[PDB]
């Protein structure tokens, strides 16, 4: 039943971009997968998986550097959401592309205007 | 002081095997240790440690590749079980052996019919 | 704007020392950071981040070797405390220094008399 989509963009120096999954908090267990890439061989980015635990708010599950796939297996309740946080560690603006598990079709609005704070 | 038992078996192509620890729900804490091995040199397996944190469900707490020892510390006052999930990423039916922390003594029934879903 | 303190001490061979943060569980969101160091060039130590889970007890989030920073983002609405556990893997009694995010200022009482059990 797999469904990996690709979000592409540009991330400014020191910027952060958050892309949400299963914002509808619908029923969907099993593997989350994502990998972060850049066309820039000198990119320096970190990918962070956040989950809204069960109600306490958002918390990190794990993180990886660019080109290292991030895999995570979950059966926490009913439904629940995840966010992929991309952090540019460099001062250099660069392309990114993120391949990630999606619950439903990729929408423009999956890219959040603001990460969790 | 570690109590470490070794589970052996055969895992079919693309198959998954879960093994329960502390099924009897005793109160324990301290280091969990496991390491997955295979006699097949082109084996490609993943070991995943799962727990049920409470009013919440089963989820992954960490993972390691074959031959990479998995070490993890917790201390819960209630009697919580853990599950080792062995994933065969290869098509080749392969030997496995799992060295892992056990509470008392290994039993055939520790191999579950179904991983948490 | 981060407040990073440095704890310094000496850790006996095979010893473990735990340092608590945010001990009253005041509400916070953002990154927890710590890195373990030693003036012993040969030091062999592990740093483990533990979180108090839901009153259920303490559980490891992640771990790193000496000299490798540990970062973790939490945006939970209820405050929670954390522990940095320093394990001396060597039999050699060694200096340590831990640079870590603090919420107040560093206090003597942050050095726990005992790690969770």
Structure description:
The structure is a homotrimer of 117-residue chains. Chain A is mainly beta. Chain A has a single domain (1-117), classed as Jelly Rolls (Sandwich), CATH 2.60.120. Chain A is 0% helix and 50% strand. The first copy, chain A, contains no helices and eight strands. A four-stranded antiparallel sheet of chain A has the order 1-8-3-6, with no helix packed on it. In chain A, strands 2-7-4-5 form a four-stranded antiparallel sheet, with no helix packed on it. Chain A is globular, with a radius of gyration of 14 Å. The relative contact order of chain A is 0.41. Chains in contact: A-B, A-C, B-C. Chains B and C meet through strand 6 of B and strand 5 of C. Chains A, B, C: Disulfide bonds join 18-115. Chains A, B, C: This is -derived mitogen. Chains A, B, C: It comes from Yersinia pseudotuberculosis.
């Amino acid at each position: 039943i797999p469904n990996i989509a690709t979000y592409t963009g540009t991330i400014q120096g020191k910027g952060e971009v958050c892309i949400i999954g299963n914002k509808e908090g619908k029923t969907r267990g099993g593997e989350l997968y994502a990998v972060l890439h850049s066309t820039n061989v000198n990119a320096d980015m970190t990918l962070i998986l956040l989950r809204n635990v069960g109600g306490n708010g958002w918390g990190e599950i794990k993180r990886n550097d660019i080109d290292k796939p991030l895999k995570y297996e979950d059966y926490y309740t009913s439904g629940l959401s995840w966010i992929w946080k991309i952090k540019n560690n460099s001062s250099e603006t660069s392309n990114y592309s993120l391949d990630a598990t999606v619950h439903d079709d990729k929408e423009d609005s999956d890219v959040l205007t603001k990460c969790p704070v």
